[PDB]
C-alpha cells in the first residue's frame, strides 16, 4: 500500500526539527546582518544569500552532535582577473577575527565557522560579467527572490525573478542560465566557475513538477542511506546523492511510496549498462554543464551504491504491491527504520 499518512508522520519524523530551524534562521540571520554592517566591506559586498540542503529543503534531522548547516554566498564585484582567490578570501579575515574569534577556520573554497547550535559556511564569489550585464545581474542578486531568508518548502510561490515577492515565473533562461558566479579554490589556487541560483531554481521547479515529492523523496533516500549505511558506500552522499535523485524521479509523482518505486526502478534500468561496464555516470550541473557533479565518485563506490539500490527497490516494491496495511509498513520499515510508523 503507498500509507500516505504514515509517510507524512515518517517525513515529520525525519525533517530538521522546529528548534534546528530557528537555529539554522538565527545564525544565518546574524552572519547575514553582521556583513552588511560591516564598513570595510561596504564596498565590494553586493549581496549575500542562502544555499545548501537545509535551504532547498532536502536535508534531514541531524543526529547525536551535529548541527544544523548554513552554507553562506557572498556576492563580491571583485575583479576575478586582477585578484587571486587567495586575496579575495583574505579580505574577510578581519570581519572573522572580529565576530568570530577562534571558531572559524579556511577551509579550500570557503570559511567554516563553528558555533554551538549551527555550522556556518562562508563562500566568497565574484561577478565576472561586467558593465550593463554586471549591473541587471547584481539586480537580481539584490532581489527578494535571492535574499529570502524562507526554506523552499516554506514557500512554495518562490521563483527566481527579481520582480518575485513573497503568479510570476522564473525570469527567462537568457537572463542567468549562462551566467555563473566565481568561487576561488585554494587547493587549486583559480577561479572556478559555480551557480548555485541555477541549483537552487531547477529544485523548486522539479519539486513543483512532482506535487511536493521531490524534497521529501530526497529526504528519505538520504535517511535510508543512513539507516543503512553500513551496506553502503560512503558516497555518494549529501549533493551528488540528491542529485542522482533528482535524476531519477519522473516528473508528476504522485505519492512517496509510487515515486520511491518508480525512481529506483528508473535508476537501475537507465544505469545498468554503465554497471555493467563497472563505470560510473557523468552527470550535469545545473547551471555549470560543464562540470560532472560525480567527479569525485568513484566508479567503485557508484557500484555499490547500485547494487544497494538494487537491494532496496525489491523492498519497495512489494510494499507498494503488498495489500495488507501492517505487511506494507513493516516492509517500508524495513527499508527506513522505527521512525516510519506502523498504521494504528
Ligand atoms: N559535487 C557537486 N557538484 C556541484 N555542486 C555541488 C557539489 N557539492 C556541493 N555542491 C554545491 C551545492 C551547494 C553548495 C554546498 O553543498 P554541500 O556540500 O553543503 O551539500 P548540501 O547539498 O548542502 O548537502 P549536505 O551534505 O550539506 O546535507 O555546494
Ligand atoms: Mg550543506
Ligand atoms: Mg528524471
New binding site residues.
Given amino acids: 500500500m503507498e500509507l500516505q499518512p504514515q509517510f507524512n508522520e515518517f517525513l515529520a519524523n525525519i525533517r530538521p526539527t522546529d528548534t534546528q530551524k530557528e537555529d539554522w534562521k538565527s545564525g544565518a540571520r546574524t552572519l547575514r546582518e553582521r556583513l552588511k554592517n560591516f564598513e570595510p566591506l561596504k564596498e565590494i559586498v553586493v549581496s549575500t544569500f542562502l544555499?545548501?540542503?537545509?535551504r532547498?529543503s532536502?536535508?534531514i534531522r541531524p543526529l547525536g552532535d551535529k548541527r544544523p548547516?548554513v552554507?553562506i554566498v557572498v556576492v563580491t564585484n571583485l575583479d576575478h582577473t586582477r585578484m587571486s582567490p587567495t586575496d579575495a578570501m583574505d579580505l574577510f579575515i578581519p570581519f572573522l577575527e572580529k565576530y568570530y574569534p577562534g571558531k572559524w577556520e579556511t577551509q579550500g573554497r570557503s570559511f567554516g565557522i563553528t558555533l554551538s547550535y549551527v555550522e556556518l559556511?562562508l563562500?566568497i564569489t565574484a561577478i565576472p560579467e561586467s558593465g550593463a550585464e554586471k549591473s541587471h545581474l547584481e539586480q537580481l542578486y539584490k532581489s527578494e527572490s535571492v535574499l529570502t531568508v524562507n526554506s523552499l518548502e516554506e514557500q512554495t510561490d518562490w521563483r527566481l525573478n527579481k520582480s518575485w515577492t513573497p503568479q510570476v515565473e522564473d525570469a527567462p533562461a537568457s537572463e542567468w542560465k549562462a551566467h555563473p558566479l566565481v568561487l576561488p579554490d585554494r587547493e587549486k589556487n583559480e577561479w572556478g566557475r559555480?551557480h548555485?541560483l541555477a541549483?537552487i531554481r531547477w529544485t523548486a521547479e522539479k519539486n513543483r513538477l512532482c506535487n511536493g515529492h521531490y524534497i521529501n523523496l530526497v529526504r528519505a533516500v538520504k535517511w535510508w542511506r543512513q539507516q543503512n549505511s553500513e551496506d553502503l558506500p560512503k558516497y555518494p552522499?549529501?549533493?551528488?546523492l540528491?542529485?542522482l535523485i533528482g535524476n531519477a524521479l519522473d516528473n508528476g509523482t504522485t505519492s512517496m511510496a509510487q515515486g520511491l518505486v518508480q525512481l529506483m526502478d528508473t535508476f537501475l534500468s537507465r544505469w545498468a549498462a554503465i554497471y555493467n561496464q563497472k563505470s560510473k555516470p557523468w552527470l550535469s550541473?545545473h547551471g555549470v554543464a560543464e562540470?560532472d557533479?560525480?567527479?569525485?565518485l568513484t566508479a567503485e563506490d557508484f557500484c555499490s551504491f547500485y547494487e544497494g539500490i538494487a537491494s532496496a527497490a525489491e523492498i519497495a516494491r512489494n510494499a507498494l504491491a503488498s495489500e495488507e496495511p501492517q505487511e506494507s509498513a513493516q516492509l517500508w520499515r524495513q527499508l527506513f527504520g522505527s521512525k516510519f510508523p506502523l498504521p494504528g
Avoid at 293 to 296: D, G, L, S
Wanted: hydrophobic content about 25%; glycine content about 8%.
Fill in positions: 544555499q545548501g540542503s537545509i532547498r532536502t536535508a548547516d552554507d559556511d563562500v559555480t548555485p541549483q552522499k549529501g549533493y551528488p540528491e542529485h550541473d562540470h557533479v560525480m567527479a569525485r
